């Protein structure tokens, strides 16, 4: 007797499009976070301030 | 200089230890031969002493597998005035 | 939903890392995975790896 | 894309943990940071570079 | 600790059988051992740690060959610190690495030779002259560093023919 | 010495995170005062450095190596300065958070000595130090094999007093 074979992907979804919302406002820091003098700056492997 | 004779016995004892490694460790062989070669040149150029030492090494290295030892050996026999042995 | 932090937490300000640390992990793992490897105590085991 | 994001999310979970950050996912995953397989990654990287 | 020693010997032996599990875990252990060595400021923990690193080097040599330069710097650094059992176990490990690697550590021989010849002489940092001599044996043996020691350290023949006419141990 | 620092601490608390500006002026002097001052005040300064660090939080990073060196020097088996410094560690751990694992290895030798030989009445210098170790969090990963045996020896020792044993057990609870 064949068992209930439940290995198939009963759905193949696909990510059709992408929205890249980037709120950087490069330069001016927001009021919340006071940043350090050296600080973590790299953004997608780019120094924005350069 | 009187202690030298005994020193050669310890040379041969510790060389016999490096025949045990040589028969067990194929990866260590060419290092051992080089060690062996460098060691013999610090040792004195008397023909008896060399013969003793080479017989030990002959437990696992035929004379064809290391010429330079045996030519230098033959050369000592020539310089020391024992050409019969040098010939053999 | 994927989110960089728990509600109380703040993102790290550490000058060695990117600001974009989470996005960087999700989207360029091998790049931060190697940079992170070089910041740990386990680098002592491989000298000449800056 | 989802599979790539979650594969790479497991690395985020491990890395960010070492800086007082816990990433969050909506279909919540159980904590993988201490899986043995990460020791295999460490060694693999080490030997490679 | 005795069980710990006994397990790491056993696990090291299986690192050829199933390296995928054992080699990652023994690497993790190696790191911990070297942390306890360097960062614990305690005689006993450092003493045990060296002892343990002895057993790792000997039983899992494949794992340890790539990490020989780190381990050896960590161990030489303990010998150049200003407890007897740490130095005795640190020397017993250096002797075991020599045996594992070889030529691969021919750079470090002249460093360790200075260190050990300082210790063969002098009962101020009185380690076991037994193990000093044992590890010195192993460097000269494995690394293949012969006859040069009599030039570079001319007192070696005055030092070593002194132990044959001073100390009362057979070993 | 004293009243100056009661102000400087009050100044930083009243400012908020805008006090960070003043750090490079304040700190180098403030640390050198701790190195030089005459005994009676050093417990007090270390209390206030702790306050300083809690306000400034992660902007203390650049002066941290000096701060640790200071602690390392003035940690003794003396009960008085230990409660003070152990409190100053708790304030450095929350301040740095993830960056504390760089400095923890300097401090470990002293912490392992605290458990080994604590002559404190009811082992309160041990109990206080357990409460700090609870805050360390994932900093403790690379050093757990060093810290853990002493903590375990603490709750299995029958000679040791009950508070110090619950304190040890509760810690292993948290660290889990």
Rounded Cα distance between F31 and F65, Å, is 11
User: Do C22 and D47 touch, CB atoms closer than 8 A?
Assistant: no
For chains E and D, having 3+ Cβ pairs within 8 Å is answered yes
Three-state DSSP class for residue C2? strand
Name where chain C breaks: residue before each gap, C-N > 2.5 Å: none
Instruction: For residue C2, list its beta bridge partners.
Output: D25
User: Do E63 and E20 touch, CB atoms closer than 8 A?
Assistant: no
Closest residue of F to E31, CA-based?
F142
Rounded Cα distance between F2 and F44, Å, is 8
E strand or H helix at C3: strand C2-3
- Residue E138 φ/ψ region, left for φ over 0, alpha for ψ in the -120 to 50 degree band, beta for the rest: alpha
**Interchain pair A41, C10: CB under 8 A:** no
| DSSP secondary structure of F104-137 | HHHHHHHHHHHHHT--SGGGHHHHHHHHHHHH-G
Q: Using beta carbons and an 8 Å cutoff, which residues of C are at the interface with E? A: 41-42, 44-47
Q: Give chain C positions within 8 Å (CB) of D3.
A: none
User: Do F115 and F161 touch, CB atoms closer than 8 A?
Assistant: no
Tokens matching residue F116: 């080994």
Three-state DSSP class for residue D24? strand
Nearest chain D CA: its distance from F97 CA (Å) = 6
Closest residue of A to C13, CA-based?
A40
**Interchain pair D18, F141: CB under 8 A:** yes
The resolution, in Å, is 3.2
Query: What residue has token string 């060093």?
Result: F146
A39 close contact with F: CB closer than 8 A: no
Q: Which has the closest alpha carbon to F48: F84, F100, F99? A: F84
Residue F153 phi, psi dihedral angles, 5° rounding = -60, -30
User: Any long-range contacts for A16-25 (C-beta under 8 Å, 24+ apart)?
Assistant: A24/A48
**Interchain pair E40, F146: CB under 8 A:** yes
Those residues whose C-beta lies under 8 Å from the C-beta of residue B28, and which sit 6 or more positions away, are: B21, B22, E102
User: Do F56 and F20 touch, CB atoms closer than 8 A?
Assistant: yes
**Contacting partners of chain C (3+ CB pairs under 8 A):** A, D, E, F
**Interchain pair C18, A35: CB under 8 A:** no
**Interchain pair E35, F143: CB under 8 A:** yes
**Contacting partners of chain B (3+ CB pairs under 8 A):** E
User: Do D1 and C26 touch, CB atoms closer than 8 A?
Assistant: no
Rounded Cα distance between B50 and B53, Å, is 5
Nearest chain D CA: its distance from A9 CA (Å) = 14
Rounded Cα distance between C36 and B11, Å, is 53
B35 close contact with E: CB closer than 8 A: yes
Angstrom CA distances, A50 to A27, A34, A41, A43, E109, stand at: 10, 20, 10, 12, 50
CB burial of F137-176 (b: ≥16 within 10 Å; e: otherwise) equals: bbbbebbebbbeebbeebbeeeebeeebbebbeebbeebe
**How far apart, in Å, do the first and last CA atoms of chain D sit?**
28
A33 close contact with F: CB closer than 8 A: no
Nearest chain F CA: its distance from D20 CA (Å) = 6
Angstrom CA distances, F5 to A27, F50, F66, F153, stand at: 36, 12, 19, 41
E4 alpha-carbon distance from chain centroid: 19
User: Do F132 and F89 touch, CB atoms closer than 8 A?
Assistant: yes
User: Do F72 and F113 touch, CB atoms closer than 8 A?
Assistant: no
Output the known binding site of B for 1D-myo-inositol hexakisphosphate: 79
Angstrom CA distances, D46 to D12, E59, E92, stand at: 19, 21, 27
Tokens matching residue F56: 């400034």
The neighbour count for residue F63, using CB atoms within 10 Å, is 21
Rounded Cα distance between E56 and E10, Å, is 10
Q: Give chain D positions within 8 Å (CB) of C17.
A: 19
For chains E and A, having 3+ Cβ pairs within 8 Å is answered no
Angstrom CA distances, F4 to A18, F7, F51, F122, stand at: 58, 5, 14, 36
User: Do E97 and E57 touch, CB atoms closer than 8 A?
Assistant: yes
**Interchain pair A34, F61: CB under 8 A:** no
Three-state DSSP class for residue D25? strand
C21 close contact with A: CB closer than 8 A: yes
The coordinates were experimentally obtained by: cryo-EM
Q: Which has the closest alpha carbon to B15: A39, A9, E146? A: E146
Closest residue of C to F57, CA-based?
C13
Q: Using beta carbons and an 8 Å cutoff, which residues of D are at the interface with E? A: 36, 39-40, 42-43, 46-47
Output the known binding site of B: 79
**Interchain pair C28, A45: CB under 8 A:** yes
Rounded Cα distance between B22 and B7, Å, is 23
């Amino acid at each position: 007797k064949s068992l209930a074979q439940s290995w198939r992907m009963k759905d193949r979804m696909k990510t059709v499009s992408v929205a890249l919302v980037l709120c950087l406002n490069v330069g001016v820091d927001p009021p919340d976070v006071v940043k350090t003098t050296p600080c973590a700056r790299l953004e997608c492997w780019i120094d924005p301030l350069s | 200089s009187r202690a030298y004779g005994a020193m050669v016995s310890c040379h041969m004892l510790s060389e016999l230890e490096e025949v045990i490694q040589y028969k067990l460790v194929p990866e260590r062989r060419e290092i051992i031969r080089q060690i062996w070669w460098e060691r013999l040149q610090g040792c004195q150029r008397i023909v008896e002493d060399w013969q003793k030492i080479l017989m030990v090494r002959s437990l696992v290295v035929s004379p064809h597998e290391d010429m330079r030892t045996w030519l230098k050996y033959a050369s000592l026999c020539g310089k020391s005035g024992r050409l019969a042995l040098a010939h053999k | 939903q994927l989110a960089a932090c728990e509600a109380t937490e703040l993102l790290p300000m550490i000058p060695d890392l990117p600001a974009d640390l989470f996005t960087s992990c999700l989207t360029t793992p091998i790049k931060i995975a190697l940079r992170w490897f070089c910041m740990q105590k386990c680098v002592s085991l491989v000298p000449g790896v800056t | 894309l989802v599979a790539s994001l979650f594969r790479n999310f497991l690395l985020a979970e491990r890395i960010m943990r070492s800086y007082n950050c816990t990433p969050v996912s909506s279909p919540r995953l159980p904590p993988t940071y201490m899986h043995a397989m990460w020791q295999a990654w460490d060694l693999a990287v080490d030997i490679c570079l | 600790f005795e069980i710990r020693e006994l397990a790491i010997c056993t696990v090291g032996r299986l690192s050829s059988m199933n390296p995928a599990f054992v080699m990652p875990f023994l690497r993790k252990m190696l790191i911990q051992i070297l942390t306890e060595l360097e960062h614990s400021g305690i005689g006993r923990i450092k003493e045990q740690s060296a002892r343990m690193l002895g057993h790792l080097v000997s039983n899992a040599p494949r794992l340890i060959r790539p990490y020989m330069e780190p381990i050896l710097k960590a161990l030489i650094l303990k010998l150049k610190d200003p407890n007897p059992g740490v130095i005795n176990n640190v020397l017993a490990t250096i002797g075991e690495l020599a045996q594992v690697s070889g030529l691969e550590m021919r750079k470090w021989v002249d460093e360790l030779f200075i260190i050990i010849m300082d210790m063969l002489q002098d009962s101020s940092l009185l380690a076991k002259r037994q193990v000093a001599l044992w590890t010195l044996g192993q460097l000269v043996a494995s690394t293949g560093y012969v006859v040069e020691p009599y030039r570079k350290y001319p007192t070696l023949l005055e030092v070593l023919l002194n132990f044959l006419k001073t100390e009362q141990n057979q070993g | 010495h004293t009243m100056v620092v009661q102000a400087i601490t009050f100044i930083f608390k009243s400012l908020g995170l805008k006090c960070v500006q003043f750090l490079p002026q304040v700190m180098p002097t403030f640390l050198n005062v701790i190195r030089v001052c005459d005994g009676a005040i050093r417990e007090f300064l270390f209390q206030q450095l702790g306050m300083l660090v809690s306000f400034v939080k992660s902007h203390i990073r650049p002066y941290m190596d000096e701060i640790v060196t200071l602690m390392r020097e003035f940690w003794v088996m003396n009960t008085s300065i230990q409660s003070t410094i152990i409190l100053l560690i708790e304030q450095i751990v929350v301040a740095l958070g993830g960056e504390f694992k760089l400095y923890l290895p300097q401090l470990i030798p002293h912490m392992l000595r605290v458990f080994m030989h604590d002559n404190s009445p009811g082992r309160i210098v041990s109990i206080k130090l357990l409460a700090a170790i609870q805050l360390f969090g994932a900093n403790l990963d690379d050093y757990l094999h060093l810290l853990l045996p002493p903590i375990v020896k603490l709750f299995d020792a029958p000679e040791a007093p009950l508070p110090s044993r619950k304190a040890a057990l509760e810690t292993v609870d948290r660290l889990t």
